[PDB]
C-alpha cells in the first residue's frame, strides 16, 4: 500500500484509504451513494483508491470535455481494464489504442440515420406482440412485471436487429477483483471467463448456422467485404455486446419511464395525446413521426437523467498529461460521477423531482452537455445512442397508444435503486396496465 | 519438480514425469488408455505424477483390499481433493475423515433395503412416463436419442425420490488444476465454484419451500430429530450431490445396456423372456420380482464390467504405511484402475467381447470382487449401490416389456469412449425402437 500516498502527494483532497483495501468499504452505499458524497465533501476535484488503483474524479465541465473528447485518441482512449475476458477481448466495448480504433472505425456505419431508418419497419412488429402480450395481463385483473414484459420485446428487437431471429419471448466475486486485480492474469490462464463457455460456444456456431439485409450480422458480414477486415470470431464477439446492451439497458429504462410516467400521471396524459396527434386513429409509429414526438424525447431525457444506467465515465490516463492546469500522471483512472452530476443541485433545481420541461426547448439550452451524459461523449461514447433511443420510443408510443398505467399496492414508491452494482431498482417494477 | 523423483528412489517403476506436467500429456488417449497401457507395461504396481503429485497404481487384490478396506479408517480415508468447492465441501462424497464418518452414519439409512422398498411403488410411475414417451418417438419412423429419454426419465426418478417434485421431463479447465492445484486457494477466496452460484441458490430456498414420506429429504428432515445432528445448508449440499449420480450415472449406465442390447440381439431376447415369465400379461415389476431376474442381474453386471462409470478409485495415503510389504509414503495419491482391471485379459477371457454368462451362478465365483467394483468396496463404497440397481433394473423392465432395439445407420458400431474426462460414448447412442 505504498501507492496510497499518491493524492496526498499532488495535493488532491480525498477519503483516507484502508490498507490493501483502498478506499472500497465505502461501496456499502453504492456507487452513486459514495460519489454524490464525494461530491459534495471536497467538490470539483477529488481521489480515491479501488484497491490499490488510484481513481481522480472531476466535475468540471472544460476537464470532462477535454478528457472525453480533446485527448481522447492522445492520453485517455482506454476504459479500465475489468478481465478475465478471454475471446471477448476483441470486443469494442472492451479492445483498446489501436485495435479499438480499428473495431470503431469498421462498427460504426453499422448505426448510420439511413442503417436505423431500414430497421424502424423491422423493429414495428415486435411492438404489437408486446401489446398483445400486454392484452393478456391485463384483460384481468393482475399486476404486470415491466422488466419481464420489456425485456421480452428488447430481447425480440435483439434477434431481429442483430441475426434475423424472429422469435415470441414467451417460448458477486467481482469485488475481490479490485482487492486482488493481480488474479486477472490468473483466472485467464485457467479459461476461467466472465461467461461461460456455453452462452458464447452456442453463439460461436450459431452465427455461422445463418448460414449461409438488415440486421447487425448481415451488416457486419458485409464489412467483411485503411485497416484490415474483420475476422470470424470478432464479429460473434460483437454480436455478444450488442446483446448485452440491447437487451438489458433499453428494457431497463423502460421500467424507470413506465414508473416515472405511473407516478406522474399528468405526464403520461400531455404524452398520450401528443402520440394521438401525430398519429392519429393510432397510426403506426415511423422513424420521422419518431423524431417528431417532443414531449416523448424530454420524457425519454429527463429519465435518463435521474438513472443514468452508466452512473460512471471512465477512461484510463495512459501517460502524464496535464489537463486544464492540473497534473494527472500516467496510469490514474480518470471518472466522471454521471448519476451525481445529473443530481447535482448546482445544476438542476429539484433535482430528484422528476420534471421533463427541463428539456423544453424553452430550456434544453440552460444544460451542459457534459454535466448530462447518459451516452458518453466523445470518440468512444455509445456506439448504439441513436438506436437505443429510437428502439425505446418506438415500444412506449405503441404501448401508450392502447395502455395506461397505475400504482398498485405492491407497486414501490418511492422507488429505491439497487444498494449494489448496476443502477437497477431493488424490488422489480410492477404497476397496474388498463386498456383505453 | 522436486517431487518427481520419489517413485525412482523407492524403486517402483513408471513413465518418466516432465517438469511441472508430470505425465498428463499421456490423458491424449484418456486415463483408461494410459492405465490400461501401464498396466501392461509394468505390471501390478506402477507410478506417475498428476502435475508435481505422485500417484501409485495397485493391482493386487489383497492390496486393494487392504486400502479399500482394512486400513480405510486409519490410514486411507478420503479421496484426492478436487476444489475449489465452497459450501459443498460439507458434501459426503468430498468430506474427510471425522466429518465424512458424521455424514456416511447420518445419511446411510436413507439406502436400506426397507426404504428402497417404500420407493418402488413410487418409482413405478416414471417408467410409464419413460414408456409413453417412448411409444410417440417410436410409432413414427424416427431413432430415438436413449440419453435424452433415459436422462428424462432419471430427472424424473431423481426430483421425486429427493423432493417429491412430479414433474414430466418434457416440460475443459480441470486440467490447470493439476498443473496448478496451488490455485485451488485462490479460486476458494474469489467465491469461484465448479457449480454456478445459481443452481445451488435454486435449491438453498427451494429446499425451505417444502416446505412445510418418502423421498430423501423427508428421509433427512426426519434425521435431525453418537454425532451431532444434520444442519440446513448440510442437508440441500447433500440433495446436490444425490442428483448428480442419480442423473447422469443412471442414464448414461442405461445407454450402454440398450446399446449392448440391440447390438447383441440373442441377449436382448433371451432377457425378455425373463421378464414375460416372472411378470406374465406384462404385470407390474416389484421390489421383489426385480430381484428374482437373474439374467437382468447378469445383463447389468456385464455391462458395468465394460463401462464401469467411476473408472478409477482413489483414497489418499494420510500417513507412512507398509500395505502387504510395500512401503508408501504419506500424501500419496493410491489408485485402482476399475476399467483397466475389468478389461485385463489375466482375469477375463475375451475381454471386450459382452457376455453376461461370466455373471452366471455357474460362473460368477470365478470372479475377485476386487478386480470387479463398478461401486467400490469397503465403507466408502457407493452409498447409492442398491438404489442405483434398483432404479435402472426397474427401467429395463418396462422399457423391454414393451419396445425391442435395433441399430440404425447412424448407431456407432463398434461405440467409441469418450476419449476425454468421463466415461460417456462419443457420438451419443442412437437406436431403433420397434413396439411389440
Ligand atoms: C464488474 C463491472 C461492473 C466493474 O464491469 C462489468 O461487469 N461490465 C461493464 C463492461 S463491458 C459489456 C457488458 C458485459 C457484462 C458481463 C460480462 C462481460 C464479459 C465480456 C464483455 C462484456 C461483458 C458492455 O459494454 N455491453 C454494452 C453496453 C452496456 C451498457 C450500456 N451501453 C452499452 C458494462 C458497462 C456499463 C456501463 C457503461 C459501459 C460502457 C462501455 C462498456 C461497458 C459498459
Ligand atoms: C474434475 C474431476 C473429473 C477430477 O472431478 C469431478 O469433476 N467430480 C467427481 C468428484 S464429486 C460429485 C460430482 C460433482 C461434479 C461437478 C462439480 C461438483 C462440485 C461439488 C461436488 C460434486 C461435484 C459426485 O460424487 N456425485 C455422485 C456420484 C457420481 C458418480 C458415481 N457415483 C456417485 C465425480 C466422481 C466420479 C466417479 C466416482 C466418484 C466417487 C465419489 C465421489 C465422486 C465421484
Ligand atoms: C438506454 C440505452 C443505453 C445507454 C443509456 C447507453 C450508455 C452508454 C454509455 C454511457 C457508454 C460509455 C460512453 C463513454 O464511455 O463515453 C456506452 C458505451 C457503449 N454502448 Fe451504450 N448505452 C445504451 C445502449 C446501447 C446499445 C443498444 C448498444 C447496441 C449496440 C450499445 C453499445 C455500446 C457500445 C458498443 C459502447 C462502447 C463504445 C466504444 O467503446 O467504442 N449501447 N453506452
Ligand atoms: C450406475 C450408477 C452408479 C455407479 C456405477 C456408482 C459408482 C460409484 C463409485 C465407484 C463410487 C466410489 C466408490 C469408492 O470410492 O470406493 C461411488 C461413490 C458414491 N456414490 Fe455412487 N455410483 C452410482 C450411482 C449413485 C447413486 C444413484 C447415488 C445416489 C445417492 C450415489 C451416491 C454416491 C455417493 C454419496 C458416493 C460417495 C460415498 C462416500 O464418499 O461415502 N451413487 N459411486
Request: aromatic letters at 10%; one cysteine or more.
Amino acid at each position: 500500500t505504498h501507492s496510497h500516498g499518491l493524492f496526498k502527494k499532488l495535493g488532491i483532497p480525498g477519503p483516507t484509504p484502508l490498507p490493501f483495501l483502498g478506499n472500497i468499504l465505502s461501496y456499502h452505499k453504492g456507487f452513486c451513494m459514495f460519489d454524490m458524497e464525494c461530491h459534495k465533501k471536497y467538490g470539483k476535484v477529488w481521489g480515491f483508491y479501488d484497491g490499490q488503483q488510484p481513481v481522480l474524479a472531476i466535475t468540471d465541465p472544460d476537464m470532462i470535455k477535454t478528457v472525453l473528447v480533446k485527448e481522447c485518441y492522445s492520453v485517455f482512449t482506454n476504459r479500465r481494464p475489468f478481465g478475465p475476458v478471454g475471446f471477448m477481448k476483441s470486443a469494442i466495448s472492451i479492445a483498446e489504442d489501436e485495435e479499438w480504433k480499428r473495431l470503431r472505425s469498421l462498427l460504426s456505419p453499422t448505426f448510420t440515420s439511413g442503417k436505423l431508418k431500414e430497421m424502424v419497419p423491422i423493429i414495428a412488429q415486435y411492438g404489437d406482440v408486446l401489446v398483445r402480450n400486454l392484452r393478456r395481463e391485463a384483460e384481468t385483473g393482475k399486476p404486470v412485471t415491466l422488466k419481464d414484459v420489456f425485456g421480452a420485446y428488447s430481447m425480440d428487437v435483439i434477434t431481429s436487429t442483430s441475426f434475423g431471429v424472429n422469435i415470441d419471448s414467451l417460448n458477486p466475486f467481482f469485488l475481490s477483483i479490485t482487492v486482488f486485480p493481480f488474479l486477472i492474469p490468473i483466472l485467464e490462464v485457467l479459461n476461467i471467463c466472465v461467461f461461460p463457455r456455453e452462452v458464447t460456444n452456442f453463439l460461436r456456431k450459431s452465427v455461422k448456422r445463418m448460414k449461409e439485409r438488415v440486421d447487425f450480422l448481415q451488416l457486419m458480414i458485409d464489412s467483411q467485404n485503411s485497416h484490415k477486415a474483420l475476422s470470424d470470431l470478432e464479429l460473434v464477439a460483437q454480436s455478444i455486446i450488442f446483446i448485452f446492451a440491447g437487451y438489458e439497458t433499453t428494457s431497463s429504462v423502460l421500467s424507470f419511464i413506465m414508473y416515472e410516467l405511473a407516478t406522474h400521471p399528468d405526464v403520461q396524459q400531455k404524452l398520450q395525446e401528443e402520440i394521438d396527434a401525430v398519429l392519429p386513429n393510432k397510426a403506426p409509429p415511423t422513424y420521422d413521426t419518431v423524431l417528431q414526438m417532443e414531449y416523448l424525447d424530454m420524457v425519454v431525457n429527463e429519465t435518463l437523467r435521474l438513472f443514468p444506467i452508466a452512473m460512471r465515465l471512465e477512461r484510463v490516463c495512459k501517460k502524464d498529461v496535464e489537463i486544464n492546469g492540473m497534473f494527472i500522471p500516467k496510469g490514474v483512472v480518470v471518472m466522471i460521477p454521471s448519476y451525481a452530476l445529473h443530481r447535482d443541485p448546482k445544476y438542476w433545481t429539484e433535482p430528484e423531482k422528476f420534471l421533463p420541461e427541463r428539456f423544453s426547448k424553452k430550456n434544453k439550452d440552460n444544460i451542459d452537455p457534459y454535466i448530462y451524459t447518459p451516452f458518453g461523449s466523445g470518440p468512444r461514447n455509445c456506439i448504439g445512442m441513436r438506436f437505443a433511443l429510437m428502439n425505446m420510443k418506438l415500444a412506449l408510443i405503441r404501448v401508450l397508444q392502447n395502455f395506461s398505467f397505475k400504482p398498485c399496492k405492491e407497486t414501490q414508491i418511492p422507488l429505491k435503486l439497487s444498494l449494489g452494482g448496476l443502477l437497477q431498482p431493488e424490488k422489480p417494477v410492477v404497476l397496474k396496465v388498463e386498456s383505453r
